[PDB]
Symmetry: C2
Subunit: 210 residues, 2 copies
């Protein structure tokens, strides 16, 4: 029975400024924090933990900025893939090949028998998502159905809860297409400053709406 959580990581540049460290070191703190967060989500019973790694727009950051971020996200998977199920999706054509190749090999040997999945979405953008689905089925089916759309969306199931730390109240190209009933939670805390208590009080807020 799916119960799933989506995180929109944010605040690494601001944290690097706050701490007086490089962007690389802030993204290293992000890797550590996302491993923590993945374990919190698993402990809390979520069946999939979705992490929005990147938008299409993000890949127009500088080459160094893209490498910093993509390496830091991939390092989460290097550390976790042997003890959870790893999957990924998105507008893969904008993801630099080096990261796609590495993430695919990690996916291929990840722990497929795990009841818990870490799922990365890369290159998020509703317009690119819809264009890809259209082009796959164009002329090949009589009509698009809700089932076929759900089976081809980047996020493969409805998202129950979405958390965005870092102070910005916006989706920034990360909205999950097939989640009309998702509950959203925003907080100012930068991702790298989030504690388990911060996560727990976010879940109190999210769970106490229903």
């Amino acid at each position: 029975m799916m119960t799933n959580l989506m995180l929109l990581p944010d605040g690494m540049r601001r944290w690097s400024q706050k701490q007086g460290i490089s962007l690389d070191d802030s993204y290293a703190a992000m890797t550590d924090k996302l491993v923590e967060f993945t374990g919190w989500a698993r402990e809390e019973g979520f069946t999939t933990f979705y992490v929005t790694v990147s938008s299409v727009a993000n890949y127009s950051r500088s080459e160094e900025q893209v490498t910093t971020a993509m390496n830091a996200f991939t390092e989460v998977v290097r550390r976790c893939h042997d003890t959870l199920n790893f999957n990924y999706s998105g507008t893969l054509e904008v993801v630099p090949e080096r990261w796609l190749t590495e993430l695919e090999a990690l996916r291929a040997k990840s722990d497929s028998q795990s009841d818990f999945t870490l799922h990365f979405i890369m290159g998020m953008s509703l317009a690119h998502e819809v264009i890809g689905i259209f082009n796959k089925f164009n002329g090949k089916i009589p009509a698009l159905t809700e089932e076929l759309l759900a089976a081809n969306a980047y996020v493969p199931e409805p998202v129950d809860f979405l958390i965005r730390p870092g102070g910005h109240v916006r989706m920034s190209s990360f909205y999950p297409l097939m989640s009309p009933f998702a509950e959203m939670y925003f907080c100012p805390t930068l991702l790298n400053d989030m504690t388990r208590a911060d996560f727990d009080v976010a879940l109190e807020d999210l769970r106490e709406r229903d």
Copy 2:
């Protein structure tokens, strides 16, 4: 630089409970409030004021509830259409045809030369929107382009700012397809309790935000 604004109306049933009045009278207050809000948005220089009238799910309400709501939204347009440009879009097949006929007549009588547009989206639901676009172009084009998608989405441009009163921190069926970087503002105030000051401080919050569009500052 030009900006637009979208409002997600919410809170009519709770307001009827709070005020001790019928749902119909709460929707009458909503009509009054939306006429106010439309004027505030125009005064603030927004090019278009978008109102998310309904989701597809809304049309599973009772027939009386649907008529009450659709009449109350249409009354907004009856009152203001003569001095602005009115347009509408959405999953129109789920809207009872009476309202489509009246709204089309009001659009025809509205001021197409106006520098301000009131735009209603009805039957919002991204799955239905996408399915409608697919079925329109299926087998008729070699590939879907961003340009064609933008020209056929319910909301005809990216939305800069959207406001959701009523306390729910969620987008329901109302997230605008072609707005990756819309700023969202939520507040607990029920729509029918919102004052001009409430609107003004929402705009302070929205306008102060640093919009980055997925990039870092240069």
